């Protein structure tokens with residue numbers, strides 16, 4: 001039950017967000033109706049030699065609307081660690097036909113945004 | 126068994142088809158003789174998030190001639206859910222030396238088509 | 251265990267062969283003295299639907315001299331399925347410090363050859 | 376493990392970089408992050424005379440505050456350790472990057488910006 005795409009890594013202190021109309025990863029094999037979903041934050045911690053937990057940079061993964069760990073949330077749902085993106089013309093319907101990725105069958109698609117969209121401040125890949 | 130490539134998803138009512146000479150997926154690990162095969166339609170049925178059974182958008186998978194579920198089908202044979210493609214110069218011989226994909230050893234190759242390929246309405250690549 | 255590089259796939263009828271001075275894969279993290287080794291043919295066979303054994307295309311993998319499945323062979327050793335390549339300036343000494351690749355620790359380097367060299371007839375990647 | 380493949384020392388000269396050079400290229404890191412150390416590792420094999428022989432030493436990069444010398448302050452003198460930092464990097468531990476787990480990630484091929492000076496016997 002993995003994301004179809006590689007993650008965005010949060011080095012800065014600000015949560016991920018995109019202006020309305022931006023942020024949907026490029027997927028040339030999908031329809032314009034499909035271009036809508038959410039990024040979900042995944043946090044990891046590593047115990048250091050002093051016994052204390054240290055936070056690795058949070059990673060944000062994209063899931064199409066109606067798929068993934070938050071498949072039940074409607075577009076725009078207000079929830080910590082969840083942010084929403086949609087391209088103009090996308091349909092607000094669940095993308096059941098896309099679903100999630102089986103890592104044993106498909107490798108992750110390298111997340112690419114359009115040539116005119118840059119990553120939000122503090123985000124790297 | 127499994128197609129070497131990801132599927133083309135049929136988003137509309139038009140079935141998959143290609144003008145003569147078009148439609149063979151890009152694969153640099155193949156010769157001009159090898160550029161011939163068929164797409165096979167596959168349809169899924171699932172229970173939606175609302176708890177109702179629905180038919181998903183059909184998916185079309187490419188297999189080289191003489192491989193896959195219709196390995197015994199001669200090139201050009203009429204069969205529902207099967208359409209044929211061949212690049213100019215391809216040979217009407219079975220492609221056993223390419224075969225099919227074992228998901229345990231190889232992930233699927235993202236299906237790419239050259240620019241200028243005519244696609245029916247509802248198909249994207 | 252594995253080769254540091256991806257394989258060359260033999261679609262044609264001719265064994266792999268390079269003119270003297272060509273054929274060593276590009277690896278900018280190695281020394282000029284290191285640029286010498288062999289390609290080893292690996293063949294896979296599958297029993298077809300007609301009960302006949304089918305040969306998948308042979309794959310040729312590069313190993314530095316003194317490493318890999320034929321680590322004991324001297325340069326130029328005459329053995330079926332083994333062909334030798336060396337760049338001008340390479341030293342005829344075993345490359346123990348390079349060794350082979352652990353696929354769990356390193357991905358395969360995509361095999362690239364210098365611009366002046368083209369793949370022998372019938373070979374693809 | 377180090378996030379990157381090693382720099383192999385083919386000759387007698389140890390690894391070192393002029394000030395400002397030597398940090399591996401990593402697009403998943405900020406300008407603040409471009410600082411760390413290389414640590415030398417040497418393995419042995421039995422030579423033709425039966426005596427143990429040094430193979431070419433390998434130098435692995437770790438971000439500041441991570442890896443085997445995570446407790447070493449930047450610039451600390453220790454044999455087998457050399458320090459590198461790009462202009463603009465911050466002298467703070469890079470715990471948010473950490474080290475690589477070979478089960479989840481393969482090593483990144485170590486690349487250096489064009490014009491980087493390497494000692495004799497080093498290639499990248």
Ligand SMILES: [Cl-]
Pocket residue numbers: 011012405407408
């Ligand atoms: Cl940072």
Ligand SMILES: [Cl-]
Pocket residue numbers: 029030031034097098134
């Ligand atoms: Cl789709």
Ligand SMILES: [Cl-]
Pocket residue numbers: 156158159261262
């Ligand atoms: Cl062929």
Ligand SMILES: [Cl-]
Pocket residue numbers: 279280281284347348383
């Ligand atoms: Cl080397």
Ligand SMILES: [Zn+2]
Pocket residue numbers: 011404405408471
């Ligand atoms: Zn950082």
Ligand SMILES: [Zn+2]
Pocket residue numbers: 029030031034097098134136
């Ligand atoms: Zn779709």
Ligand SMILES: [Zn+2]
Pocket residue numbers: 155156159222261
């Ligand atoms: Zn072929």
Ligand SMILES: [Zn+2]
Pocket residue numbers: 280281284347348383385
């Ligand atoms: Zn070397």
